[PDB]
Write an enzyme that holds these catalytic residues in place. Sequence first.
Site, mmCIF file in Angstrom:
data_model
loop_
_atom_site.group_PDB
_atom_site.id
_atom_site.type_symbol
_atom_site.label_atom_id
_atom_site.label_comp_id
_atom_site.label_asym_id
_atom_site.label_seq_id
_atom_site.Cartn_x
_atom_site.Cartn_y
_atom_site.Cartn_z
ATOM 1 N N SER A 112 0.836 -1.211 0.000
ATOM 2 C CA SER A 112 0.000 0.000 0.000
ATOM 3 C C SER A 112 0.863 1.251 0.000
ATOM 4 O O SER A 112 1.669 1.438 -0.925
ATOM 5 C CB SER A 112 -0.924 -0.086 1.212
ATOM 6 O OG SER A 112 -1.983 0.841 1.137
ATOM 7 N N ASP B 254 -9.854 -4.533 -5.357
ATOM 8 C CA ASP B 254 -9.359 -3.836 -4.176
ATOM 9 C C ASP B 254 -10.356 -2.808 -3.684
ATOM 10 O O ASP B 254 -10.733 -1.898 -4.420
ATOM 11 C CB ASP B 254 -8.043 -3.197 -4.604
ATOM 12 C CG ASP B 254 -7.255 -2.553 -3.480
ATOM 13 O OD1 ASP B 254 -6.019 -2.741 -3.452
ATOM 14 O OD2 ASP B 254 -7.863 -1.867 -2.642
ATOM 15 N N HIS C 149 -7.250 -5.683 -0.417
ATOM 16 C CA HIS C 149 -6.173 -4.707 -0.414
ATOM 17 C C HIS C 149 -4.952 -5.132 0.395
ATOM 18 O O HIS C 149 -3.814 -4.988 -0.050
ATOM 19 C CB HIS C 149 -6.702 -3.376 0.167
ATOM 20 C CG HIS C 149 -5.629 -2.323 0.150
ATOM 21 N ND1 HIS C 149 -5.114 -1.861 -1.037
ATOM 22 C CD2 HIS C 149 -4.961 -1.666 1.129
ATOM 23 C CE1 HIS C 149 -4.173 -0.948 -0.778
ATOM 24 N NE2 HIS C 149 -4.071 -0.802 0.535
#
Length: 242
Positions: A89, A188, A218
């Site tokens: 991320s 996601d 995610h």
Amino acid sequence: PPKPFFFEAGERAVLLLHGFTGNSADVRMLGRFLESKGYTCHAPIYKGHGVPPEELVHTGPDDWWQDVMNGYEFLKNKGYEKIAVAGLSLGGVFSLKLGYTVPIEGIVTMCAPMYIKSEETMYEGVLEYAREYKKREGKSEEQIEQEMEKFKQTPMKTLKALQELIADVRDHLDLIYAPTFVVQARHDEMINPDSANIIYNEIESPVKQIKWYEQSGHVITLDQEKDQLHEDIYAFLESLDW
């Protein structure tokens, strides 16, 4: 309380970078896997992470970037000459940035965002993280409600700077030449998945790969396809020159 980790294993080193509101536990199973395959791994914890959420809102990407760079130098200073980086991320955004800032052997970005959301919507995600943290402390419904009322009495100013970071790294993708593996959850729920195509198509790296995971969310390192993910990353890293 999570801690950074350093797993010694062989001459090849990997820096592992967690996501926003995350901590080193998000990349710990990947670190143990890579360690079992001969890779030394180090995962820092960004400022304001792995501590009460109240502390998070007084930090921002200028702080977190220093933790990233210190994590790179940690490896260097312990005798590791060649370092790859893998990031989850926001960690993947920082992986890319490190890739045009210092010598990097290879880059793995996992579900890194290249589009942003409103500051309100990003603060809504900080609020939900604070709720889950306090639920997990084992606070009462009533206690959590009081503490969250008060948490709201303090803005997180640095959310604009986090938007600016994503935009800035996006604009610098053409400076990246290191071998890069782009990993993305097809479905996601936290970011625009087309981010992966932006990274794959705009870097200049002659060696690039992208892989989509169809049954993951995610936070892909903790989801049901993590074992295949581990093997794919290992395969990518074994393909580098080192």
